[PDB]
């Protein structure tokens, strides 16, 4: 088999569509997601044309090996897609309608800057390479792009699944390549982060601030050091759910800042004890009373600054 | 091979059945389960009809390649099922009996709202896409739906395996699609959660309440902060066995609420110490004595409220 | 190819044997084990019979495709076995000798009631489904059942590998099915649990009891709470190596009971401090002295009761 | 099929190229990385030459089975590459142009000495084994070596992808072997290590040094021991992201050194308490005051020495 | 295809060789290692004899399916090897030279008694089963046994790769089997265990001994209990890298013994406090002073005894 011959000098247009059946396993650390979908292909092959009257058939079915089929690949996949051909239908003018169901693990970078209040645009890049005989170009049949209503991605909200209609045509290894960008827009369900990480982390921080209403150094050291350790546990927990980024994430920024608050609280607790031992408690009392206001105020303002820089 | 031709205009009815052999790996985080089962298919193909008197044979056995077989797929699977054909039998009137043994990893959402006292309905969706020549519709042969007595799903009780007899017929990418819903009803074995998570979590909480019978601030801080850390460990342990949900689970609610009790216990311990330092112990004594009753009472009532909202 | 025809009305007897080459990966949480073995099959096929004199051979070697071979399956496997045919040999009277080497992941429930002093019976269920043409029944050739001397299952002692000689014949979807039960008896190597979990867990408990020889409330609180946290760590460690069971395991029972001992030790430490503060130390001394005997005595008796109930 | 015959006595030159499409999963512990790339091959097969004016066709497209193709393998792969042939083109003179898209998991040792400020040279070794008929030698077509602009390796910066043009020709098992070295130069994005591991580890260390401004032994013991435990947690966290090395890494050296600082701080806190109990506080005061300067000074100098030895 | 016929009555000798290309993933817990190697095979099949004059060629190249190939298997593999035939060369007398490149996960028991200062002998067992027509025996061609210079097993030193030249010929299921033992001798790189586990574990132990220079019970309890918890963390860390053994490992013995030292240190700290409360500090001072010498001395002697018993 060889590619369909051009009537004039035109490129062969392969119309495409992706219909999502299942979306699962969005792995943040790996920056991958698994997909199960229909891939539809359509092109004209004059050599397969027929007259309906003398044939007695309005449509003709073929086996993949019997006819020429464009070698369509995904750019951003781990391994080649697992595909099973569903149907190959030919109309009288030789218009081929190809349908396959596939499953693939897709590599798509994620922007963690606003985590866990982030949104992402996942990409599925469709590609075809041209042959010596002719140039093969991809197109989007919008009527064949979509997703099942039941498509759920655990921990995410699916906003839209659209295709950038104009392909990116370019040369690769001295042959032209036609690339389409299918975009799946998603937004993270931040809900669970509030009772599981955010609030517990705030509670332990506020508990360390009770040391500003205590003159007991031994108790103060216990309050600040114990809560700091619990903060380290949350920092470790958060970083296990995320890849290493060359930038600060919103959560990472807050987590990092909270260490400064623990560090300054230890200085305050030390200064307070030192003065009381040096028979200067009036003074230590001034520092402690100021700290009761300063710590929550600086915490609020620093958070407003951070939220502003990130959102 | 091509589909059996219609006598009139009727759709081809493919009778189905699923008989569960093994159920394993119900993964809560992934919202998947693995299944090993028999898939039974039955349809009439008049082209295969024969005379039983002259043939002397009641049944003819065919190889899958020799005859036309409907392309039956599962909607909610990770990858296409791993199937092995067991038997193909044809009756004299041309009724085909197909039997395969398959294994598949099934995607089925779980409702964690009542965890670990939850029940689930797992789904296995069977599907067929109509061909250009004719419309294919699915039916349930109840005589071929079931499960082996030894079918065990570790940590769950299997209640029933039934099929919704009426298929969901709909158009998808300009063809008809016939979908059947096989339902596996299961209930979680909550037993182990009691001695492993629930009771240990209650013991540490009650231990924090012994601070209401102590005037030692240093010991009190140690009691409340140490048990709080142990509570954080249980919170982390619980969240590792569960996916992130856009809602509160029953366990999540209790775990979250317990933080409030630790937070208020720290305030009480602080207030008590502050008053004793300020030479107001009679007052501190009133707050501490009230706390001895208030803490267990509010804990009981808050739990009754939560159990009511969730069950 | 079709099954051997019956001389009278007899079912076809397929003689079986399993010879274990390798046993590995007994996964307690998954309740699976991996096996690498020889599967031997033998049956009479008269159509294959030959005269040794005429043919000039005493044995005939065929390829699997050339002759009829029974469709033998394993019931309790995750996926169908990975098998490679080693030999097919036909004797002059049509006695077929089939040999394959296979590997499979087997599902076999485990009873954790006596963990880590437990013994198990792993099962490998061989099955055959009858054909329209004839009924197929399985038998055990004891001369072909065994295991390599070097077969080792990490963390277990292999006791025996035997087969229940009488098959379980039953109807499944109006066809006879013949099931054989191959049993691998194993006993857990409990050794390492003693220095790694049991003794460390007892040491920390005994350390909590030193609080019965101390009047220092602050030190007592530190002793009991710190050791309780270490006990929580061991509880978590143990539960990670085990699946969730709808029953109490021996270790689970001891682990759970030890919490009660920590809880009562906290009450004692609290009561002691409360009385001393209330200027009643003579009394507190009576409770503390009683506790020094009561705690180890009740611990020993409770352990004798538990060991009795479990063994 | 057999290899192309030599015109004189020359070895067959197979021109190669690797074009990276995707780079993912650089696993530090496993010392592996996954790659998805184009592999291009070119050689002269005179038996395939044709006339350009007579034939009318400028290029002939063959199926892999139709022609002789050199058996090209990767040395440093876990399993054989997953490959799909994209195109085979023959020019009039018989120059074959082969193109495949492959995916592979590559074993490539990493030097962790400067971790997390390390750079690596990943290798992809291409190999060909000569045949009895003739010797096969590899060459690099630099026009066919490259990488997609979008190639991202999470947590790393990709510097260059080049090939050592001169193959390593050697005898192995009495036949010639021709090996090419493709080099992917990468540098680790150390950014995230600063707020996640480095700074938290420095903060806890500085917190231990507040014990040099405290006379309270009980508080000092709590400060030094608690922070040491947090240091152990960071040591464990770091070692989980790294394989075991027969050398010290930069981070490993710092982590190890910090233990010495905790050890000496415990000695100081002990010495201070001992002297105060012995009614020698003037002296304990001299040791404590010296420690306030000595600890940060020795820490700075030891770090300058370490950075010098490692960079 | 059938086996080559014997000239007299001798068994067919299949000469073997294994050349290691890659060694990776030595998994201590699983007692497995992955291997990528060349498997060379050589046997005489006179039925393949040819005249170079008539056929033109001096050596014939065959496809595996075209000729008889001995069914060579590995005994100790999880699944059947992933193999790809590199060459099948037949010389005029009928001597076959077979070369395949394979990858396999090998089961090989490990002796952890001296861990992490242990050495191992990994085995790769090659096997052939005899057929009816004739007996097959294996031999080692030493010229074809070896390893690539670049072969590295992360965390191990490779000493030698040799074969036991004499096969183990034995009967199995009424047929002969010929088994060869390929041995890979390795020694563990213990380096990293010193700064990561050994020294940190010794530092925390020595820190607990500072309690012998302190009269503060509350500080002593904190010193001994905190370091004990850190010791538990190291015990857990070590046991995660190792399988459960029915014997004591060297590290396991030291780790276990250190618990006894913590237990006795708690007794000492308790005894000291008890006597001081009972107004007997002179005596308490004698016990504490003795402990300062006894603890390090008994620790040194117990380690000399253990090192002696293990090495
Ligand atoms: Cl693809
Ligand atoms: Cl499917
Ligand atoms: Cl099976
Ligand atoms: Cl029955
Ligand atoms: Cl029957
Ligand atoms: Cl390869
Ligand atoms: Cl093998
Ligand atoms: Na084609
Ligand atoms: Na068919
Ligand atoms: Na057969
Ligand atoms: Na070829
Ligand atoms: Na304390
Ligand atoms: Na063969």
Written account of the structure:
Chains A, B, C, D, E: Pfam families: Neur_chan_LBD. Chains A, B, C, D, E: Belongs to the ligand-gated ion channel (TC 1.A.9) family. Chains A, B, C, D, E: It comes from Gloeobacter violaceus (strain ATCC 29082 / PCC 7421). Five copies of one chain form a homopentamer. By secondary structure, the first copy, chain A, is an alpha+beta fold. The first copy, chain A, folds into two domains: about 1-190, Acetylcholine Binding Protein, Chain: A, CATH 2.70.170.10; about 195-310, Methane Monooxygenase Hydroxylase, Chain G, domain 1, CATH 1.20.58. Helix content of chain A is about 35%, strand content about 35%. The first copy, chain A, has five helices and eleven strands; from the N terminus they run ββαβββββββββαααα. Chain A has helices at about 50-55, 195-210, 215-240, 250-275, 280-310; strands spanning about 10-25, 30-45, 60, 70-75, 80-90, 95-105, 120-130, 135-140, 145, 155-170, 175-190. In chain A, strands 1, 2, 3, 5, 6, 8 and 9 form a seven-stranded mixed sheet that branches. In chain A, a hairpin with a 4-residue loop joins β5 and β6. In chain A, α2 (about 195-210) packs antiparallel against α3 (about 215-240). In chain A, about 35% of the residues are buried. Chains in contact: A-B, A-D, B-C, C-E, D-E. The structure holds chloride ion (7 copies) and sodium ion (NA) (6 copies). The site of one chloride ion has 5 residues of chain E, from β4.
């Amino acid at each position: 088999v060889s590619p369909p011959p051009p009537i004039a000098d035109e490129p062969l247009t392969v119309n495409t569509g992706i219909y999502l059946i299942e979306c699962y396993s969005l792995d943040d650390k790996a920056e991958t997601f698994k997909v199960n979908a229909f891939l539809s292909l359509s092109w004209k092959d004059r050599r397969l044309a027929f007259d309906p009257v003398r044939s007695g058939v309005r449509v003709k079915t073929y086996e993949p090996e019997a006819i020429w089929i464009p070698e369509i690949r995904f750019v951003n996949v781990e391994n080649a897609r697992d595909a099973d051909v569903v149907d190959i239908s030919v109309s009288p003018d030789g218009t081929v309608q190809y349908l396959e169901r596939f499953s693939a693990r897709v590599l798509s970078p994620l922007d963690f800057r606003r985590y866990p209040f982030d949104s992402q645009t996942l990409h599925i890049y469709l590609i075809v390479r041209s042959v010596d005989t002719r140039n093969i170009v991809l197109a989007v049949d919008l009527e064949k792009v979509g997703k099942n209503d039941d498509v759920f991605l655990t921990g995410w909200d699916i906003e839209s699944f659209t295709a950038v209609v104009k392909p990116a045509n370019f040369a690769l290894e001295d042959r032209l390549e036609s690339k389409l960008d299918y975009q799946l827009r998603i937004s993270r369900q931040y809900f669970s982060y509030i009772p599981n990480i955010i609030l517990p982390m705030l509670f332990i921080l506020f508990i360390s601030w009770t040391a500003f209403w205590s003159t007991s150094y031994e108790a103060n050291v216990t309050l600040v050091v114990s809560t700091l350790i619990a903060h380290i546990a949350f920092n470790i927990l958060v970083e296990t759910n995320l890849p290493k980024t060359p930038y600060m994430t919103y959560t990472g920024a807050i987590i990092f800042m909270i260490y400064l608050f623990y560090f300054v609280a230890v200085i305050e607790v030390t200064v307070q004890h030192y003065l009381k031992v040096e028979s200067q408690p009036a003074r230590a009392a001034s520092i402690t009373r100021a700290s009761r206001i300063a710590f929550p105020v600086v915490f609020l303002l620093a958070n407003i600054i951070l939220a502003f820089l990130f959102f």
